[PDB]
Swiss-Prot record:
Quaternary structure, from the entry: Homodimer.
Comment text on domains: The TPR repeat-binding motif mediates interaction with TPR repeat-containing proteins.
Domain of life: Eukaryota
Subcellular localization, as worded in the UniProt entry: Cytoplasm
Functional description taken from the UniProt entry: Molecular chaperone that promotes the maturation, structural maintenance and proper regulation of specific target proteins involved for instance in cell cycle control and signal transduction. Undergoes a functional cycle that is linked to its ATPase activity. This cycle probably induces conformational changes in the client proteins, thereby causing their activation. Interacts dynamically with various co-chaperones that modulate its substrate recognition, ATPase cycle and chaperone function.
Protein family according to the UniProt entry: Belongs to the heat shock protein 90 family.
Name listed for the protein in its UniProt record: Heat shock protein 90 homolog
Binding residue positions for ATP: N37, D79, K96, F122
Length: 212
């Protein structure tokens, strides 16, 4: 499998470093942000399906799914949205403008929670995670895995190790030891009900209970 390496733009590498290092208190906002991206990605596939309902056939169910993996200290956020082609992942760039604007607003004293308003709320995941894999499948393209440690370099490899998505995106968040509360059914239920009431799509939570 060929791991293509790429370097992050200097503004993107500095944004990633700011968030991963910050002390922000309301770190739970990351979930609103990722859910909001997943909901938007679903809106995008649903729009195409208004024209062409064959676009939905790669994964007919439209959903956001939250999958804690206590064994691996991993929280996965999966959507069956539009997904991202390999070219998308290697060049993901409205980010450039929103990264600069958001950085200016932070100087003026904006709170970290305003990140979504500048369109770069994906990077809020580094509040609770030190490393991240992003697995994506766009309809007319193959399934790839993007990877970043918040440094200045990310990889994009063909996906030969993860479950097939059918269509969409799954973020594998490698949580920090301080933020392992977000693997908890009850803690995750709190954050979702608080900040994502108005989501057109089912937010499914996967829970592994032992049969007694
Ligand atoms: C989701 O995985 C990745 C990987 C690198 C960069 C981005 C990203 C970055 C932004 F700054 C702003 C927006 C994005 C993503 C956010 C996103 N999330 C999800 N769940 N699905 C899609 C299609 C996108 C999308 O279209 N663009 N997302």
């Amino acid at each position: 499998a060929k791991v293509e390496t790429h370097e992050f733009t200097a503004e993107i590498s500095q944004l990633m470093s700011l968030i991963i290092n910050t002390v922000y208190s309301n770190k739970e906002i990351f979930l609103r942000e990722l859910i909001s991206n997943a909901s938007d990605a679903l809106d995008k596939i649903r729009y195409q399906a208004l024209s062409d309902p064959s676009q939905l056939e790669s994964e007919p169910e439209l959903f956001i799914r939250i999958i804690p993996q206590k064994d691996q200290k991993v929280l996965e956020i999966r959507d069956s949205g539009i997904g991202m082609t390999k070219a998308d992942l290697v060049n993901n760039t409205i980010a450039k403008s929103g990264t600069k604007s958001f950085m200016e607003a932070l100087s003026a004293g904006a709170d970290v929670s305003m990140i979504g308003q500048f369109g770069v709320g994906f990077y809020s995941l580094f509040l609770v995670a030190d490393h991240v894999q992003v697995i994506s499948k766009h309809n007319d393209d193959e399934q790839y895995v993007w990877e970043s440690n918040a440094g200045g370099k990310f990889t994009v490899t063909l996906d030969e190790t993860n479950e097939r998505l059918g269509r969409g995106t799954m973020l594998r968040l490698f949580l920090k030891e301080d933020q392992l509360e977000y693997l908890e059914e009850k803690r995750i239920k709190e954050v979702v009900k608080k900040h994502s009431e108005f989501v057109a799509y089912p937010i499914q939570l996967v829970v592994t209970k032992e049969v007694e």
